[PDB]
Amino acid sequence: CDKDFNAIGGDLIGDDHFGLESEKYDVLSYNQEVTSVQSNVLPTSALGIYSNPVFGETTANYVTQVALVAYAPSIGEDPVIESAVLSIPYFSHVTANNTDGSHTYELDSIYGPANGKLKLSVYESGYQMRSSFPSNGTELPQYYYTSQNSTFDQAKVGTRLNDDLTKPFQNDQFFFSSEEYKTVTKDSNDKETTTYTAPEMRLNLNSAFFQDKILKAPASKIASTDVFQEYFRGLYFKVEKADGSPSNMALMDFSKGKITITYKAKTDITTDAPETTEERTIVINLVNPTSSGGTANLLQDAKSAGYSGAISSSNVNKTEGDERLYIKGGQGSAAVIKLNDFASKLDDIRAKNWKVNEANLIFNIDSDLMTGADEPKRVYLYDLTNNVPLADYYADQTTSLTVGDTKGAKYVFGGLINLGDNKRGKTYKIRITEYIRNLIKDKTAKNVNLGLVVTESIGITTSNFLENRIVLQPNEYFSQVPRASIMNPLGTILYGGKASVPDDKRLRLEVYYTKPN
Amino acid sequence: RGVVPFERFYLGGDGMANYSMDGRETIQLRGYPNNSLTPIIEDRNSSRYGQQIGATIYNKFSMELRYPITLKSSASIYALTFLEAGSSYPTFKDYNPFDLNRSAGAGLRVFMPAFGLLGIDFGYGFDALPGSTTNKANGWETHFIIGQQF
Amino acid sequence: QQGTASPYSFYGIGDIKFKGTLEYRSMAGVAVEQDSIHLNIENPASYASLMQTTFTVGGTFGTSTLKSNTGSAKAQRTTFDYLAVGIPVGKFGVSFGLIPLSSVGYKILDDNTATEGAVSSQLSGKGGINKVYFGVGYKIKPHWTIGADVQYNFGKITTTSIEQVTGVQNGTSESNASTLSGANFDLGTMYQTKIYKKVNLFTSLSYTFSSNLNSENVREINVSGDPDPYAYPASTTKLKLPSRVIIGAGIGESRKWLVGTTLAFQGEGQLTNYYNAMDNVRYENYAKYAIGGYYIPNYTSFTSYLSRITYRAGLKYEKIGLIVNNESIKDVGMTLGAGIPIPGYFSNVNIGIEFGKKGTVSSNLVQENYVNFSVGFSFNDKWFVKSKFN
Numbered sequence A: 001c002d003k004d005f006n007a008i009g010g011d012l013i014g015d016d017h018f019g020l021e022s023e024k025y026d027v028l029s030y031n032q033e034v035t036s037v038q039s040n041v042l043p044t045s046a047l048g049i050y051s052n053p054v055f056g057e058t059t060a061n062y063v064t065q066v067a068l069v070a071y072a073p074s075i076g077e078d079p080v081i082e083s084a085v086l087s088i089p090y091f092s093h094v095t096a097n098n099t100d101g102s103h104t105y106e107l108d109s110i111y112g113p114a115n116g117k118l119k120l121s122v123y124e125s126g127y128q129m130r131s132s133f134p135s136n137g138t139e140l141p142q143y144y145y146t147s148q149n150s151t152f153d154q155a156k157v158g159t160r161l162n163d164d165l166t167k168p169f170q171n172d173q174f175f176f177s178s179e180e181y182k183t184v185t186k187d188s189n190d191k192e193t194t195t196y197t198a199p200e201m202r203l204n205l206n207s208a209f210f211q212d213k214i215l216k217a218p219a220s221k222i223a224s225t226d227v228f229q230e231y232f233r234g235l236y237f238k239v240e241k242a243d244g245s246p247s248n249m250a251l252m253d254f255s256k257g258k259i260t261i262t263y264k265a266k267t268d269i270t271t272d273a274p275e276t277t278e279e280r281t282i283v284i285n286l287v288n289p290t291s292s293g294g295t296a297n298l299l300q301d302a303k304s305a306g307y308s309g310a311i312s313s314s315n316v317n318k319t320e321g322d323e324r325l326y327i328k329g330g331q332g333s334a335a336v337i338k339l340n341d342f343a344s345k346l347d348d349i350r351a352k353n354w355k356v357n358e359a360n361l362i363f364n365i366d367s368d369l370m371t372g373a374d375e376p377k378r379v380y381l382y383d384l385t386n387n388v389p390l391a392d393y394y395a396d397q398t399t400s401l402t403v404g405d406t407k408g409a410k411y412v413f414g415g416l417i418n419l420g421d422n423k424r425g426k427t428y429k430i431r432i433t434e435y436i437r438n439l440i441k442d443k444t445a446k447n448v449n450l451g452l453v454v455t456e457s458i459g460i461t462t463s464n465f466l467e468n469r470i471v472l473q474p475n476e477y478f479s480q481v482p483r484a485s486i487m488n489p490l491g492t493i494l495y496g497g498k499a500s501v502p503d504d505k506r507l508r509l510e511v512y513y514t515k516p517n
Numbered sequence B: 001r002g003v004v005p006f007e008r009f010y011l012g013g014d015g016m017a018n019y020s021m022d023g024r025e026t027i028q029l030r031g032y033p034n035n036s037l038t039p040i041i042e043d044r045n046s047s048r049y050g051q052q053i054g055a056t057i058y059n060k061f062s063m064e065l066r067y068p069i070t071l072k073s074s075a076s077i078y079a080l081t082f083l084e085a086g087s088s089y090p091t092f093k094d095y096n097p098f099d100l101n102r103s104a105g106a107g108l109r110v111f112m113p114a115f116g117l118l119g120i121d122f123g124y125g126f127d128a129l130p131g132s133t134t135n136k137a138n139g140w141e142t143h144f145i146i147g148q149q150f
Numbered sequence C: 001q002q003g004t005a006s007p008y009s010f011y012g013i014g015d016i017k018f019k020g021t022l023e024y025r026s027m028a029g030v031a032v033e034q035d036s037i038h039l040n041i042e043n044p045a046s047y048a049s050l051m052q053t054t055f056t057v058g059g060t061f062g063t064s065t066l067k068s069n070t071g072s073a074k075a076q077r078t079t080f081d082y083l084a085v086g087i088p089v090g091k092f093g094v095s096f097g098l099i100p101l102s103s104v105g106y107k108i109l110d111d112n113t114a115t116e117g118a119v120s121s122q123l124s125g126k127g128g129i130n131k132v133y134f135g136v137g138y139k140i141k142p143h144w145t146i147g148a149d150v151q152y153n154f155g156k157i158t159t160t161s162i163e164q165v166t167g168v169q170n171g172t173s174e175s176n177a178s179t180l181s182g183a184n185f186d187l188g189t190m191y192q193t194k195i196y197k198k199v200n201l202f203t204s205l206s207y208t209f210s211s212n213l214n215s216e217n218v219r220e221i222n223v224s225g226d227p228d229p230y231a232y233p234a235s236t237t238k239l240k241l242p243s244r245v246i247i248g249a250g251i252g253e254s255r256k257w258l259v260g261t262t263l264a265f266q267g268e269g270q271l272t273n274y275y276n277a278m279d280n281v282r283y284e285n286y287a288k289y290a291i292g293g294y295y296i297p298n299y300t301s302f303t304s305y306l307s308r309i310t311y312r313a314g315l316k317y318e319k320i321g322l323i324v325n326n327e328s329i330k331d332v333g334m335t336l337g338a339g340i341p342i343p344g345y346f347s348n349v350n351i352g353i354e355f356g357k358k359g360t361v362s363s364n365l366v367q368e369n370y371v372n373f374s375v376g377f378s379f380n381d382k383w384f385v386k387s388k389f390n
């Protein structure tokens, strides 16, 4: 039992031969607006109108391709459609188990006031979508951008399918509900079957439309997916502000959405051969946004005066930098970060045999400007030159302490918000120890440009292309943006690296060295 | 030329007789697992880090107090208490004969002509195993052997 | 697994561990009498006086409380002290064993947490120098013996210093390792006379020659997370072990009582390595003054067994030889012991308790109060007996 330490006699031992100290370096950071981005393979899409006090108002639409579970179906003889219901499950969590079975749910990923209402319109798309197209000897991929709302809105056929005026909660006064949709069926020979379904978007579509579109359609149109997709191109979801009510936006997973058509046929009969009818059902599933490229998220934003002015090319200084950094998700903006000061002294750092203990970038949030608006829960830093994650991202294998919180992983890398006692954001710290180590260790390495942008999930590290690449400098381009950034509709304001910014809030790189002597 | 890779020493655990023909010797040091005190490869990036290469030096010091409960020809049973300390080293330049892994405990031994020598021991390790990050005692250990495993 | 916890072990080659067997350590190192069942490792001439083969092993359990002007701390250490074998060969005597020359050990922690940007240090040390000896003694006369021995010194001293700032998670750990190897020679003589009736005058003189120690140093700096360590070029330094002259004299009746005094002086040495070089620490000559003896009520007693136990006691004043902050570090202590002889054999079990004070709290130094409990086993058996009646 002699494994205990003590604090007696520390002055008698000689001093070591290494000096642990930290250095501060300036950073060049400017704003770069994100123009129309690719919204074709987004795992989660936004549907609604979100009003942000600082950034502004953003309207999100969605277009998708429909598919049949089993092609070349046998609808039957003399089919009569009974109902056409579209169901899209909502992100919800059970909050209170109640008696008599049933449950109480709370909607998740809903942005905006809880009492918001929007005018939802579901139209039949008349614009054929493809996942890829042959080119001059090559098979190029098909990309749908966030600014193509006009193309899909002009090529829409008929009127909105959800035209049941008897239920205003599905049209003209739509609102994301949290009901449990209790259903009871005495089909158990007399016994009931109380079945409950989680909150979902249930809409009653025009029965007449589906009668001739599927139940009374030529067999040559529903024989395969290629012919069906050309016949039923897709569904277009349009949102507008309701009469005298605020608007809210929600993030949904349309991969689980489907429209079930319930009808009655004449049955296989031949035994009784009467005018009897049987109950049949056909399901028209929505294409998967990940396995198909026939889904686009039409995001339109009305940038505020302050946000538009800061990200404007006339108010951006690429030489000195910007005092305030406005980073917003979706078709918003990003920040270009260059460690020019560190590169200038990189020659002397490697000559003195200095070792890097840790490197970090601390982004301070502008609490005064960012007041009354929802703050992003995490930020992401990547390599803008190569459009790939930094070496520190791969080197960090830490998982969130909370069980089931996959969004809080890689806490060593950083990016998570540091809220104060007021429950408001205070700063974001990202560690780039591995990136700095490689620069000093490897002489052939080059200091690449770094991009800061809001992220929804740290796991999604893919990138989405821009319709038109931006020329940052003579031979520098801004062509892609992280896919997790487009999904996040929130944004944050941070202090820049300009020399005019106070040293206590200015953005600067802090490197902790082990100076051997 | 270097030391030969055979005829090495392995310390820790219940121990085993020199049954192998390659010269490998297993030394018993109660209170620790089997071969837990043998030096390991510390190159880290050698693709074989953590493997037990074998020791070239070893020294064990033990003290025991035994009391006979029965010493008949049919069955000889005696109890014992021990205080051991031992260590293994990779080379002569790292030989520290007084830097040992201490342990203590008690055990029971029964010898029957037909069933042979049977022994059960309980030892406590007062030191940490090599390569351990935390300097914490190894703890209690149980050793069972049949025959003269020396 | 360290042998000492004193911060003073950082300087020189560490703290002197071996100071004689429990039979002699309990008498403050006074080994004037020419014993027949005990091994006097410090004097090679005593090997000739052995009458039966001797096997000795010893261990100790030390308890110390470090005190400074800031606070106090408690530390305890357990170690194996020695292993020696003595073999009588006619008029000659041969002895071989393993003893610890010195030990390095300290675990100091400077906790500067709870404050962002504060460096926290975790100083630690381990290792020491060990000795292997082979000595031969000869009886020039029935009560006059001379002898010589050869000792090989070997060991490794490793010093580690890990520093971590409060904020960052990756700290640095500098480690210094030194391998020392060398040989020395010792000469001794013991003369015993009879001044008065039943009273004898014991005299013993021993001399140790100066030796050169070769040290191979390796200093490497490691930082958490970085897979490539920064290693300094290998260096080789030469150390010089000082010579020792031990003079002892005492009066007493064999198996009844004994009172003696010993004076040990050391010459000039160079124990400053590359890692322990300091400006506030100097070196001086080691000097030890000790007075001790034993008392046996009645060795040949059949009524009470307590009268057959050898009771030992001793006092000691040592000048370690290092001057820290212009203050000479001295060690003062008292020792008590008892030798219980196993019935029917010359083998015995030795028990001893030593307590003293080393260092001082003045001049920002550290004072150490220790209470060490030791146990020793001396086994004796007669060998080389020829069997007649062919």
Ligand SMILES: CCCCCCCCCCCCCC(=O)O[C@H](CCCCCCCCCCC)CC(=O)O[C@@H]1[C@@H](NC(=O)C[C@@H](CCCCCCCCCCC)OC(=O)CCCCCCCCCCC)[C@H](OC[C@H]2O[C@H](OP(=O)(O)O)[C@H](NC(=O)C[C@H](O)CCCCCCCCCCC)[C@@H](OC(=O)C[C@H](O)CCCCCCCCCCC)[C@@H]2O)O[C@H](CO[C@]2(C(=O)O)C[C@@H](O[C@]3(C(=O)O)C[C@@H](O)[C@@H](O)[C@@H]([C@H](O)CO)O3)[C@@H](O[C@H]3O[C@H]([C@@H](O)CO)[C@@H](OP(=O)(O)O)[C@H](O[C@H]4O[C@H]([C@@H](O)CO[C@H]5O[C@H]([C@@H](O)CO)[C@@H](O)[C@H](O)[C@@H]5O)[C@@H](OP(=O)(O)O)[C@H](O)[C@@H]4O)[C@@H]3O)[C@@H]([C@H](O)CO)O2)[C@H]1OP(=O)(O)O
Pocket (backbone or CB within 6 Å): B091, B092, B093, B095, C096, C097, C098, C132, C133, C134, C150, C151, C152, C154, C181, C182, C183, C214, C236
């Ligand atoms: C009796 C009982 C039986 C026992 C018998 C044993 C006794 C017999 C004697 C044995 C000794 C024989 C040694 C020997 O010799 O044989 C050795 C083989 C021996 C076989 C023995 C067989 C035994 C049989 C037994 C049978 C049994 C039945 C091998 C050897 O040899 O290994 C040697 C190794 N020793 C051991 O391993 C032993 C081992 C021990 C092993 C045996 C253990 C046995 C124990 C078992 C018994 C147990 C029984 C129970 O120890 C240990 O394990 C630890 C201790 C053991 C602990 C024991 C505990 C016991 C416990 C018991 C408990 C119960 C040695 O260490 C030192 C010590 O050795 C022993 O002790 P230690 O080791 O310390 O312990 C001595 N003596 C001992 O007795 C100790 C014994 O243990 C004691 C025994 C104890 C017994 C106990 C008994 C117990 C039982 C009894 C019971 C009672 C000690 O004495 C002392 O103090 C001690 C004392 O006083 C001595 C007397 C003591 C006697 C004791 C009395 C008895 C008492 C007993 C009782 C008390 C002494 O201090 O290092 C040497 C390295 O030297 C070389 C080399 O290898 O050539 C050359 C060097 O140059 C010198 C020089 O020239 O002078 C050296 C110095 O002088 C110094 O001045 C130095 C300057 O500092 C330089 O700055 O220079 C230098 O290179 C340089 O030299 C050139 C020159 O020009 C200089 O300028 C340059 O050329 P250039 O530039 O062109 O001009 C070079 O550069 C060129 O090249 C480079 C490259 O390009 C080339 O590439 C590569 O190639 C190079 C080639 O060289 C390689 O070949 C490499 O080297 C390069 O690195 C490189 O990688 C470039 O370089 P870079 O710039 O890039 O860097 C450069 O650009 C340029 O090109 C380069 O710079 C160096 C390099 O730096 C290394 O990397 O390498 C080794 O080679 P060595 O040179 O031959 O000696």
Ligand SMILES: *[C@@H](O)[C@@H](COC(=O)CCCCCCCCCCCCCCCCC)OC(=O)CCCCCCCCCCCCCCCCC
Pocket (backbone or CB within 6 Å): A001, B063, B064, B065, B081, B082, B083, B104, B105, B106, B124, C057, C058, C059, C060, C061, C078, C079, C375, C376, C377
């Ligand atoms: C602190 O946590 C504590 C350890 O706590 C534990 O977990 C307890 C450890 C297990 C206790 C022993 C369990 C088995 C019972 C029998 C014990 C063995 C007795 C043997 C006696 C006869 C010899 C065969 O820490 C401690 O308990 C501290 C222990 C300190 C012990 C100090 C005294 C040891 C003796 C000192 C001399 C060295 C021994 C060798 C003597 C001969 C010389 C060669």
Ligand SMILES: *C(=O)CCCCCCCCCCCCCCC
Pocket (backbone or CB within 6 Å): A001, A002, B061, B062, B063, B083, B084, B085, B102, B103, B104, B126, C057, C059, C078, C079, C080
């Ligand atoms: C914490 O360190 C508690 C003390 C560690 C255990 C003490 C027992 C050590 C055993 C040493 C045995 C030496 C050899 C005995 C006969 C040769």
